[PDB]
Design a protein around this nucleic acid. Structure first.
Ligand SMILES: [Mg+2]
Ligand SMILES: [Mg+2]
Ligand SMILES: [Mg+2]
Ligand SMILES: [Mg+2]
Ligand SMILES: [Mg+2]
Ligand SMILES: [Mg+2]
Ligand SMILES: [Mg+2]
Ligand SMILES: [Mg+2]
Ligand SMILES: [Mg+2]
Ligand SMILES: [Mg+2]
Ligand SMILES: [Mg+2]
Ligand SMILES: [Mg+2]
Ligand SMILES: [Mg+2]
Ligand SMILES: [Mg+2]
Ligand SMILES: [Mg+2]
Ligand SMILES: [Mg+2]
Ligand SMILES: [Mg+2]
Ligand SMILES: [Mg+2]
Ligand SMILES: [Mg+2]
Ligand SMILES: [Mg+2]
Ligand SMILES: [Mg+2]
Lengths: 63, 67, 70, 55, 60, 206, 143, 141, 145, 80
RNA sequence: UAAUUGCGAUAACGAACGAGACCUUAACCUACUAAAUAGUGGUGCUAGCAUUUGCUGGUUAUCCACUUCUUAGAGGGACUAUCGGUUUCAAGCCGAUGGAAGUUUGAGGCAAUAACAGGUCUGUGAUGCCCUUAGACGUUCUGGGCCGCACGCGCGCUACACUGACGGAGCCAGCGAGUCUAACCUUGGCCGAGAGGUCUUGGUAAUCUUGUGAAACUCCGUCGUGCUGGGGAUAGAGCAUUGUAAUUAUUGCUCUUCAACGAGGAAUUCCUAGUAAGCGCAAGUCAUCAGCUUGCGUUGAUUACGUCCCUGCCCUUUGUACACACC
């Protein structure tokens, strides 16, 4: 388990034609100097800390 | 919401227009002002009015405002 | 009607030697040690208490709770 | 009378229970017209004279 | 408050809308200690259309 | 703790573990910290309380429910399935028994296990029916802490309920049981399995 | 210091008083007690069989101790619980006018309550005494 | 008389009235010691202010509370409020102020509204359902 | 209460009033599987007969059981109040019975017959397999039969 | 003796709804044109110094199918 | 923005109806005016326990005072205030602090123009026309019927249990109603297991019923997973109530009988905080009868704080040979 910690840095919007999904840019705290955008399930605000379970990969639009 | 209607905003304009000496950054005194200087039928509307002829002042103090 | 209702001599004697190593003891633990329907299980808890052997660290209806003595 | 009432075969639950259920039971609102509601069937007609005299 | 709660409709049709009228009864009582002259004066006049005045007496 | 006795007397152990520490039913809040980054913030502990009954207006603002004392969160969610709607006094006491029960086994601040049982069943990633045109496959998402905590509580309490249902063990026990086992999840728990398989399905499709 | 009943918690006071009257034997106890149902809004008789008249008596006493005057009607209600109308919703139902009115007469014969003016029944001069007594004995069990 | 004040508490429709006089050091509710009050599981709710702000503080005062209306919880919240509101008013007229402000402070920092009464209240139901928001079942056809 | 013991004494199951009764259940409730003896009736009989309600059917000495029945099959001499009883004011001799066991099956029948033998609408309505107490029969009771 | 009636001429009928409907009624019962009727009343009411005024006629005149008209002038408000 | 709510753009400028304002209810006043039909403190007379002064009560006037609590008058209060993120530094929006209160403060009331062959002639001594009018379709009187039961559909109630049932014990609301030429709401006392009965009684009512001692709920026991003591259908036998009348069983009580139901396919309803849900209560109806409704308070959550995927509507764009307007 190479778990990965990333700090939500920006609220970008809700995707999914439903809407329950927030597009979010996060910053790792285990070595920053790179940010990346992830899709959430639950209610999120700035400074939250997602458990990125695959350090690298990212989504865009949902349907 | 809390968008102030035209009646509120129209009075406020009309007050700031013709009483800028007198009036202030304070709604507390602008309330008492309105009573003497303006006929209004409700406490509530008067407050709704004064609170906004106040807010309008508050930023004239930093630049102008069209209208 | 599938056994636990009585006291079969060897039973009572079981419920003296078997109650140590019970980190937890309550009414519902005594049905779990393939014995005692809750009623005559409830009676035990007063008389497994008669002399130590269990410590009352909880109170009441629905829930009872004990630990081994010290 | 009541004498006939019970002696009478042909009756009681047993007998109904045994019979099949009519199909008219499990049907519909039957309606008959509802989307002809705006087409006045009076055959008649006012007239712009009359309506002008009136209104 | 005298409340009265009714369907608006004269009949049955439609979503069941309910409409409650109300009538409010206000009652004061004023206790006076005066002789016969002022009382009778004070009862016949002071009258007003819409206010029911009732003056009892007695120590029981 | 410096004895004090006025007219109508306040009990020794009452006088005691109150004015001292502000600890729970009678359990300590100091220690008890969240062993997983994040969740901290979204799991209370400090300020400390006496009982998990609070007229908490956690409702009228989007996040402020995060501030509700976790133990009390846990209790609130006990009081459901139709019949047991409201009935907080039920739950409140079910937790009391529950906590004591946990504590009896495997030592530990029961409240600490409630944290660990919470932290360990909140699923880190999941799925949500993405369109792609009717044939809606399954898209992996990174679930927020608040949802990670909620879903924990819900998952946690539920399994105990169905477990407790129809049988001799009493909610208090089974609730403790689930936690106890979810402290370091040994997949003999409704909650962990559900967590696990939900992170299995999210992995199965990315 | 001095002691009330109000100084002692509901359960323990009554149970001691119930035990007290039981420990005694001066009482009056209808006789039908054992076959009677306490309220029509109930399913089974009391589980105490031998006893429970005391528990009521003690309760009945403890209640009229705590107030000016209460009678049969009020006591019927108080003790009355809800009553499953089988397949129909519950309503609350009043309890037996006989158990109470006889608890009232019985406890009076034993001098703990007099048929107060203003109506009802009132805690007897004597009752205050004897109640406050076993109340005191009750806090003595925590001495 | 002696130095005293009256303060209240209100939750839902419970109103808890509390008389606080200088005295030997008691705290009775309706007619009984506060060490009962059962409700019970909650009892530490009404203990709360005492211990919140230090057991002592009451050695110099007596306190009575009586609650009407409300219900078996509604009252526990009402009365803790009136106790703690009373301790913080007495000092307002009798001790010094920086005391009172010290007591307000320790109460609010904890607080389940001990000094300020909860504004929440039952909302009217409206015709069309069994509840304020709820609507009756419908069917179409 | 009391951690008891007992020798071999207690026997499981036992037969009284022409039926079978499970030993390892509380004797109040064990008594119920006799037809015509609900909980109230039971509890009063056992109270009356002077038996430990706390006991199961199983223990119960054979003289205790014997008393139990004797009262059940004769309630009114042993000062049980008739309004406690399933058949006050007969309909022929006007005596107060409390029908028991297989005789409740026997006596439900007599009653049903007496109505039908007299063409009473309640009778007729029984003979037709319908509800009688005056319930609507449009919507309810559909399977049955 | 205990009951007493006095009559008392109303100060301008022109600002009293009820007085004007019965005018309108009585107009149409001498067979005034539907408008000449209502259209008059609004005009007389106005000159009685009303801030505004509205008359509706509904139902059926002369034709078979029911109509309805409105007859307003000046100022009205409708709520609260 | 909830709003044709504004900001802004701008051949428009400035206004009115509707929205908002307004009105009613629920929240806040130790500020004001008061209250033996609201209540507090003191003081008498007095009970109990301690006695060491105390603690807990009794006493529609034995007096003095007070208005915190209750009541309802007149005022006041909030204007999304202060500050700060945000944004065309616009309307605004989000956060923090303070505040009784900051979702139109919460819930309502009123609500423009227009449409429908919506429903109601079975509310009207409102009404056109048609029908009928003495073997009546007038009316009244007797008796049956609207409840009839192979079965399809809809709102409900009670449930399948151990967050339980049962039994004792704790013991807490709010909205209400109530009798004159009359039998309304009923305290209390007795008798009765019960339902009820009987003797009296206060009330035309913040005065009495009623503190509506309601229910969930809380406490300690009994039962132990067994269609069980869950569940109470169906049915027999008795006793009472309303009414002239209870059979096709008005309702209530007691014994007895003890069904389905082991959480419910496809589907589908309702809802965002003192809300959902659980829980009782008054009121309407009412001689008697609520498994309905209208309101009420009691206990009190979970999850959103979003979007256009489903469904429904609205708005522009566009086509029209429709305008009785896609029926
Ligand atoms: Mg239920
Ligand atoms: Mg009760
Ligand atoms: Mg009870
Ligand atoms: Mg409907
Ligand atoms: Mg039976
Ligand atoms: Mg029926
Ligand atoms: Mg307007
Ligand atoms: Mg409006
Ligand atoms: Mg006041
Ligand atoms: Mg704040
Ligand atoms: Mg039509
Ligand atoms: Mg009509
Ligand atoms: Mg019908
Ligand atoms: Mg119970
Ligand atoms: Mg009798
Ligand atoms: Mg009179
Ligand atoms: Mg069974
Ligand atoms: Mg049952
Ligand atoms: Mg009724
Ligand atoms: Mg109806
Ligand atoms: Mg065109």
């Amino acid at each position: 388990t190479p778990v990965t910690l990333a700090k939500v840095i920006k609220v970008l919007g809700r995707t999914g034609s439903r809407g329950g999904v927030t597009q979010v840019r996060v910053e790792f705290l285990e070595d920053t100097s790179r940010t990346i955008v992830r899709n959430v399930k639950g209610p999120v605000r700035e400074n939250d800390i997602l458990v990125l379970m695959e350090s690298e990969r990212e989504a865009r639009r949902l349907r | 919401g809390r968008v102030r209607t035209k009646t509120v905003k129209r009075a406020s304009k009309a007050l700031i227009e013709r009483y800028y000496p007198k009036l202030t950054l304070d709604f507390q005194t602008n309330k008492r002002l309105c009573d003497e200087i303006a006929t209004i039928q409700s406490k509530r509307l008067r407050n709704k009015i004064a609170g906004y002829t106040t807010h309008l002042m508050k930023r004239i103090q930093k630049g102008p405002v069209r209208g | 009607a599938q056994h636990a209702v009585i006291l079969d001599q060897e039973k009572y004697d079981r419920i003296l030697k078997e109650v140590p190593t019970y980190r937890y003891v309550s009414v519902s633990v005594l049905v779990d040690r393939l014995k005692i329907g809750g009623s005559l299980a409830r009676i035990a808890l007063r008389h497994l208490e008669k002399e130590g052997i269990i410590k009352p660290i909880s109170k009441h209806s629905k829930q009872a709770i004990y630990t081994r003595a010290t | 009378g009541n004498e006939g009432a019970i002696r009478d075969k042909t009756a009681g639950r047993r007998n109904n229970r045994s019979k099949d259920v009519t199909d008219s039971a499990t049907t519909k609102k039957s309606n008959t017209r509802r989307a002809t509601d705006r087409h006045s069937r009076t055959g008649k007609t006012d007239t712009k004279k009359k309506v002008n005299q009136g209104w | 408050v005298l409340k009265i709660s009714t369907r608006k409709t004269p009949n049955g049709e439609g979503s069941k809308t309910w409409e409650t009228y109300e009538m409010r009864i206000h009652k004061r009582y004023i206790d006076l200690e005066a002789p016969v002259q002022i009382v009778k004066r004070i009862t016949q006049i002071t009258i007003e259309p819409g206010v029911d005045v009732e003056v009892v007496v007695a120590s029981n | 703790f410096t004895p004090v006795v006025l007219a109508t007397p306040i009990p020794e152990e009452v006088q005691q573990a109150q004015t001292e520490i502000k600890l729970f039913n009678k359990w300590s809040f100091e220690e008890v910290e969240v062993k997983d980054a994040s969740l901290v913030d979204y799991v209370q502990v400090r300020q400390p309380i006496f009982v998990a009954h609070t007229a908490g207006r956690y409702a009228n603002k989007r996040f402020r429910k995060a501030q509700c004392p976790i133990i009390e969160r846990l209790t609130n969610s006990l009081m459901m399935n139709g019949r047991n709607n409201g009935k907080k006094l039920k739950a409140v006491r079910i937790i009391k028994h529950t906590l004591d029960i946990i504590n009896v086994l495997t030592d530990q601040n029961p409240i600490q296990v409630v944290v660990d049982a919470i932290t360990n069943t909140g699923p880190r990633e999941d799925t949500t029916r993405v369109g792609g045109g009717g044939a809606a496959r399954r898209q992996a998402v990174d679930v927020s802490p608040l949802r990670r905590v909620n879903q924990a509580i819900a998952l946690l309490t539920i399994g105990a309920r169905e477990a407790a249902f129809r049988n001799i063990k009493t909610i208090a026990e089974t609730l403790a049981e689930e936690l106890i086992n979810a402290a370091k999840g040994s997949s003999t728990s409704y909650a962990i399995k559900k967590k696990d398989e939900l992170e299995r399905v999210a992995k199965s499709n990315r | 210091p001095g002691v009330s009943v109000r100084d002692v918690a509901a359960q323990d006071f009554i149970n001691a008083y119930a035990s007290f009257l039981q420990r005694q034997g001066k009482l009056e106890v209808p006789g039908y007690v054992d076959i009677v149902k306490t309220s029509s809004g109930n399913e089974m008789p009391p589980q105490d069989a031998e006893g429970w008249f005391y528990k009521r008596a003690a309760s009945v006493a403890r209640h009229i101790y705590m107030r000016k005057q209460v009678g049969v009607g009020k006591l019927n209600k108080l003790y009355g619980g809800a009553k499953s109308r089988g397949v129909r919703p519950y309503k609350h139902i009043d309890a037996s006018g006989s158990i109470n009115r006889k608890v009232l007469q019985a406890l009076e014969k034993i001098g703990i309550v007099e048929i107060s003016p203003k109506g009802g029944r009132r805690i007897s001069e004597n009752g205050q005494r004897d109640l406050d007594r076993i109340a005191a004995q009750t806090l003595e069990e925590d001495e | 008389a002696v130095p005293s004040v009256q303060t209240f508490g209100k939750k839902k429709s419970a109103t808890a009235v509390a008389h606080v006089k200088a005295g030997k050091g008691l705290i009775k509710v309706n007619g009984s010691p506060i060490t009962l009050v059962e409700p019970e599981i909650l009892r530490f709710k009404v203990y709360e202010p005492l211990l919140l702000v230090g057991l002592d503080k009451f050695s110099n005062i007596d306190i009575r509370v009586r609650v009407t209306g409300g219900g078996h919880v509604s009252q526990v919240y009402a009365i803790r409020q009136a106790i703690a509101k009373g301790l913080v008013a007495y000092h307002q007229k009798y001790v010094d102020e920086q005391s009172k402000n010290e007591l307000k402070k320790a109460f609010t920092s904890y607080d389940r509204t001990l000094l300020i009464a909860d504004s929440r209240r039952p909302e009217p139901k409206k015709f069309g359902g069994k509840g304020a928001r709820s609507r009756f079942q419908k069917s179409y056809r | 209460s009391l951690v008891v013991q007992e020798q071999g004494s207690f026997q499981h199951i036992l037969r009284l009033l022409n039926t079978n009764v499970d030993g390892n259940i509380k004797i109040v409730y064990a008594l119920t599987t006799i037809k015509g003896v609900g909980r109230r009736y039971s509890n009063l009989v056992c109270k009356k007969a002077d038996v430990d309600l706390h006991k199961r059917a199983g223990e119960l000495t054979q003289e205790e059981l014997e008393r139990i029945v004797q009262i059940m099959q004769n309630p009114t001499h042993y000062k049980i109040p008739a309004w406690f009883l399933n058949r006050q004011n007969d309909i022929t001799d006007g005596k107060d019975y409390h029908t028991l066991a297989n005789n409740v099956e026997s006596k439900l029948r007599d009653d049903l017959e007496r109505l039908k033998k007299i063409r009473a609408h309640r009778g007729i309505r029984h003979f037709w397999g319908l509800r009688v107490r005056g319930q609507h029969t449009k919507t309810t009771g559909r399977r049955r039969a | 003796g205990t009951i007493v009636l006095y009559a008392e001429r109303v100060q301008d009928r022109g600002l009293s709804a009820v007085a004007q409907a019965e005018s309108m009624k009585f107009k149409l019962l001498n067979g005034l044109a539907i408008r000449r009727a209502a259209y008059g009343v609004v005009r007389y009411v106005m000159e009685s110094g009303a801030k505004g005024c509205e008359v509706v006629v509904s139902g059926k005149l002369r034709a078979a199918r029911a109509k309805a008209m409105k007859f307003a002038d000046g100022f009205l408000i409708h709520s609260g």
